[PDB]
Structure 1
Amino acid sequence: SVQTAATSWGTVPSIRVYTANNGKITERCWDGKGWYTGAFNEPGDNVSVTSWLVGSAIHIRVYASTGTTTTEWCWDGNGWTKGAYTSTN
């Protein structure tokens, strides 16, 4: 099966659902008006997510794994950027 991860914020709410399928992760988005495909598209076979609001600004962290490798991706209001996470050391 594909593998998903979901997060939400606020009371509208906004929702993001990440799906790993055949080695790629894609993103679907709800902001109160319908579902649309988001900008996030990166390699991975497994995905997890968390998020937090600072006032009205959302911060999202997506953990994309393949084999024994995990890469963190970061949204902080502009774009997706690889983060500093490593699984060890």
Structure 2
Amino acid sequence: MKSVQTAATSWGTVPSIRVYTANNGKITERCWDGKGWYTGAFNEPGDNVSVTSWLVGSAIHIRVYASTGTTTTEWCWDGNGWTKGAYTATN
């Protein structure tokens, strides 16, 4: 709880960058697409965050893993807004 905790992903050649910050129990998103940093649409509960992303042709897919206690919730971006993913784990 001494400092915020971040996770970062990027794609393409511009590039696009997404940086997720866990702070005081919530995870927010800052975005770069070549022109300046702006606040993204992702905001969900969590004390810890990790991220991965992959391209399928021209489509970006992002997975954000948000954890509180022993429960990790996966959030998915597949072109049409964030949706909850199927990830589970018994921690």
- TM-score, normalised to structure 2, is 0.95
C-alpha displacement at 1:82, in angstroms? 0.6
Where in structure 2 are the equivalents of 1:1-89 lying within 5 Å?
1-88=3-90
Percent same amino acid at aligned positions? 99
Measured in 1, the distance between the counterparts of 2:58 and 2:90 equals 33
> Where does the alignment leave 5 or more consecutive residues of structure 2 unmatched?
none
3-state SS of 2:65 partner = strand
- TM-score, normalised to structure 1, is 0.97
Measured in 1, the distance between the counterparts of 2:72 and 2:82 equals 16
Residue-pair matches, total: 89
Runs of at least 4 residues off by over 6 Å: none
> Where does the alignment leave 5 or more consecutive residues of structure 1 unmatched?
none
Coordinate RMSD, CA, aligned = 1.1
C-alpha displacement at 1:15, in angstroms? 0.2
